[PDB]
Design a protein around this nucleic acid. Structure first.
Ligand SMILES: [Mg+2]
Ligand SMILES: [Mg+2]
Ligand SMILES: [Mg+2]
Ligand SMILES: [Mg+2]
Ligand SMILES: [Mg+2]
Ligand SMILES: [Mg+2]
Ligand SMILES: [Mg+2]
Ligand SMILES: [Mg+2]
Ligand SMILES: [Mg+2]
Ligand SMILES: [Mg+2]
Ligand SMILES: [Mg+2]
Ligand SMILES: [Mg+2]
Ligand SMILES: [Mg+2]
Ligand SMILES: [Mg+2]
Ligand SMILES: [Mg+2]
Ligand SMILES: [Mg+2]
Ligand SMILES: [Mg+2]
Ligand SMILES: [Mg+2]
Ligand SMILES: [Mg+2]
Ligand SMILES: [Mg+2]
Ligand SMILES: [Mg+2]
Ligand SMILES: [Mg+2]
Ligand SMILES: [Mg+2]
Ligand SMILES: [Mg+2]
Lengths: 203, 102, 148
RNA sequence: UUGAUUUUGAUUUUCAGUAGGAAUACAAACCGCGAAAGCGUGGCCUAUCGAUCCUUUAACUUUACAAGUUUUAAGCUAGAGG
RNA sequence: UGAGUACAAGGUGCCAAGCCGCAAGGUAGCAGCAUCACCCGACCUUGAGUCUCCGACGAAGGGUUCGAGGAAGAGCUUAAUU
RNA sequence: CUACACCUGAAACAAGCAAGAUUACCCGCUGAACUUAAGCAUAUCAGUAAGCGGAGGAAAAGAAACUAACUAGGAUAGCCCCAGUAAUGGCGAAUGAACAGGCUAAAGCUCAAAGUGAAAAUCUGAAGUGGUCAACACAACAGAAUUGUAAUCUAAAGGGUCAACCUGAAACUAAGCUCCUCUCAUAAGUUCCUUGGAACAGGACGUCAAAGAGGGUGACAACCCCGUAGUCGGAGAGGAAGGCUGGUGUAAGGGAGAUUUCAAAGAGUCGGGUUGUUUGGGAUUGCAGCCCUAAGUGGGAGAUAAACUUCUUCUAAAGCUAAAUAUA
């Protein structure tokens, strides 16, 4: 232990010889995954690769501003779509029963998604018989033979261009932002003692 | 301030949801007493009798003074842990005492 | 690598530049292994190059969650640099309506004033503002808008 | 009569020009003695002394991380227990 | 809490180019060093007035102090040596 | 008292099951010192070696008594990050996870518990009959079982009342594909000189090439022989602990939505105390003994102990489950 350099942080203190991980399989592994995926396509041929995924906001204050692919559709949403979980599943839709909708907009996105899905759908019944729910589409669709990816057919755009208005500037200029944030933080701070005062002056 | 972060009111503005639209739950129905339950429990109660500590608490309740109430609580708290479960047991015992009067 | 290393040029010099008196030995010479005796014979080291190493500071956080503490900062100077040139010029000439810059979409939350602003007017949508940020924004012919 | 006091920081001695011990010169105070200038940050000067963790104390719109009120528990600055 | 008069991004001593001049020297002042000033925050100190008035806001005015900081960004990735 | 029934235990016999082996990876236990702290007890090495008990092709884990408090997310497992961070530690040496976010992979299901009571609707064996005869379908007779088998049900519900709209064991009957194993076959110089024991060398003339990877032939040979390439090609044989897809289609079986005096869920377990042990988990990280020992809007959880008011989230104390993962 000699010079000005930063205090070391021990690494190999235990017996690591038993505990090392090697990455050469990676090479072949990637490849394997490829073929797997491909062999899925072939065995699934008429149907799409990835099953239908709703969308939500991310779980953290910092992530809220972004968009994320959900695991499943909210029963509430399937209702507004008019699909039973079971059916949606026979369709290739992904359902999640513990998720709940606390916003109108979160219903909207997924409705739009579901509908979009259905509209673009082709359904093969036992040969030459037709059916009703989510319905069933004409025998000629058998010839249509669509191999498609879900991002192409059922996507989600957003562009950041924020529209400008002057009248509002005239408006917004009359308040004071700092003062605001301050008095607010303040209110949250002293709320408890204040309510307690109300209760105490009331009794 | 609802539209703002940091107000006593949570920042963001969301379109609220209807009573009809809200999450259907079951698991939230937990502490229900089905009459079947209730009856069965009463049956077995009579079939059973009280437990010795339950008896102690009972005497204390029948008396009714401040000291007696305290002791009822203390015992419930002490045998069961959880001041709360104590409160609950006091409730149950009182119910049986009161219903026994009639 | 190997042919660059000292060893090659040390071959046959017998001490390998570790000295004839003090040669290259085990932990005893290191002064004990690792951070050993920092507080004792290594006092001078610790004190001198890592002063304040031994001791305690103020307040334990049992579980610290960083996500909610997350607050990227922006400075006034980079504002116009966020939105394109098209915008600030086109509303330098056009006074009919004024530009709205959302710091949010850029991944920032609080706006601090650092430099100074063009005399051309703006609206800035941000989570928080510093006394001076608002000062300079307003004085420029601009407006502060609170987001969530 | 209590200047054996309130704030900080600096300087000199030993010196890795680290710490610690001493002492000095300032700037802000609040005082005591004297008519007053003045002199008082302890003993005429050169010795008389002690870190991390822990505890205890003084003073403070520091925290307990869904929200509160308590009780309790953590802190920041500084003494004492070595 | 946040690099506080929107039109700022300084002063001084050393000092390089370019331009003058045969020369003596003159002009200019990049980088660095030293120093003084301003700034954000810690710790102190001060405050008209304002409002969602009991807690926040702020015109004016400061520090013997503290900081791995501002003041026209210097980084990030790769290889090698010690 | 006898016959007889039932509960309990016993012997012989019939048909089946376990006993050891395996070591890399996996599971449940048990468990140290050398070493590092320049000494040394806490600590570290480290839940590490050795020891014991269990498996499998993987094991384990898994459908929340999870996170998070946001415009929320949502089984398990691996990768990347978060991170060397929060925390733990003679706060010394040194220990040290996870949420959010980017990916790989994707999958969800079975019980207990009011409801056959218009009737045990159930399970096992079976002389036997058909069969692809070890594997399938029926089956006279026998046992199991109301101290309860099967249908509904599993909280995402559900019962009851409507109901658009759906399904198909039986039998009959056509055509096919997948995967595995063992075999059989395929270009073009052995022309000429020189040196050699040998030409596969150096020269001269030639050829094939979706074949000039590599071998063997007396020497550094595309062309002499095996091969290589066309070949996820062609031909023959046998396979599936007895692979996979049709068409009619019976008794029978579902159910979006709608409404409704309905709506029931695991106990010496959860929780507490104490003592050990373990984790970063620090006055409630996990676990184990002993002592207490529940509840029923109850019960868990919301990274500081205890009340009290309000909000949030999940349903423990029964089970199954492919994939991505690990393999000295
Ligand atoms: Mg593998
Ligand atoms: Mg060199
Ligand atoms: Mg030499
Ligand atoms: Mg000395
Ligand atoms: Mg004086
Ligand atoms: Mg001391
Ligand atoms: Mg300057
Ligand atoms: Mg018997
Ligand atoms: Mg065995
Ligand atoms: Mg060793
Ligand atoms: Mg040693
Ligand atoms: Mg450990
Ligand atoms: Mg085996
Ligand atoms: Mg790392
Ligand atoms: Mg993720
Ligand atoms: Mg037979
Ligand atoms: Mg019978
Ligand atoms: Mg010859
Ligand atoms: Mg030849
Ligand atoms: Mg060859
Ligand atoms: Mg071939
Ligand atoms: Mg143990
Ligand atoms: Mg506890
Ligand atoms: Mg379970």
């Amino acid at each position: 232990m000699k010079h000005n350099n930063q205090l070391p942080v021990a690494q190999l203190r235990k017996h690591q010889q038993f505990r090392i991980k090697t990455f050469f399989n990676q090479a072949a592994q990637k490849k394997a995954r490829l073929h797997a995926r491909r062999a899925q396509a072939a065995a699934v041929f008429p149907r799409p690769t990835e099953k239908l995924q709703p969308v939500v906001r991310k779980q953290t204050q910092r992530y809220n501003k972004s968009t994320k692919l959900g695991r499943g559709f909210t029963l509430q949403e399937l209702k507004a779509a008019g699909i039973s979980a079971a059916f949606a599943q026979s369709i290739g839709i992904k359902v999640d029963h513990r998720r709940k909708n606390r916003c109108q907009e979160s219903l909207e996105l997924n409705k739009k998604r579901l509908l979009a899905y259905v509209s673009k759908l082709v359904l093969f019944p036992r040969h030459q018989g037709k059916a009703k729910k989510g319905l069933v589409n004409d025998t000629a669709d058998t010839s249509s033979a669509a191999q498609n990816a879900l991002q192409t057919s059922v996507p989600l755009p957003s562009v950041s261009k924020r529209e400008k208005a002057v009248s509002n500037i005239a408006e917004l200029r009359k308040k004071k932002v700092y003062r605001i944030i301050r008095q607010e933080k303040t209110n949250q701070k002293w709320d408890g003692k204040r309510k307690a005062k109300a209760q105490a002056a009331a009794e | 301030a609802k539209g703002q972060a940091v107000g006593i009111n949570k920042g963001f503005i969301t379109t609220q949801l209807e009573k009809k639209l809200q999450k259907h739950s079951a698991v939230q129905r937990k502490g229900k007493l089905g009459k079947r339950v209730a009856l069965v429990r009463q049956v077995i109660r009579e079939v059973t009798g009280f437990a010795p500590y339950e008896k102690r608490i009972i005497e204390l309740i029948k008396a009714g003074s401040a000291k007696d109430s305290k002791k009822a609580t203390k015992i419930a708290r002490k045998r069961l842990g959880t001041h709360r479960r104590a409160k609950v047991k006091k409730a149950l015992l009182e119910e049986a005492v009161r219903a026994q009067r009639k | 690598v190997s042919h660059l290393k000292k060893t090659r040029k040390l071959r046959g010099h017998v001490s390998h530049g570790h000295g004839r008196v003090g040669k290259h030995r085990k932990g005893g010479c290191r002064g004990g292994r690792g951070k050993a005796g920092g507080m004792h014979h290594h006092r001078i080291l610790m004190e001198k190059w890592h002063p304040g190493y031994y001791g305690k500071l103020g307040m334990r956080t049992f579980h610290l969650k960083k996500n909610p503490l997350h607050c990227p900062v922006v400075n006034i100077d980079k504002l116009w640099s966020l939105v394109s040139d098209a915008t600030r010029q086109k509303y330098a000439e056009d006074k009919k309506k004024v530009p709205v810059i959302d710091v949010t979409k850029a991944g920032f939350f609080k706006v601090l004033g650092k430099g100074r602003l063009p005399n051309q007017p703006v609206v800035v949508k941000a989570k928080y503002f510093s006394k001076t940020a608002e000062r300079r924004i307003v004085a420029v012919g601009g407006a502060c808008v609170l987001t969530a």
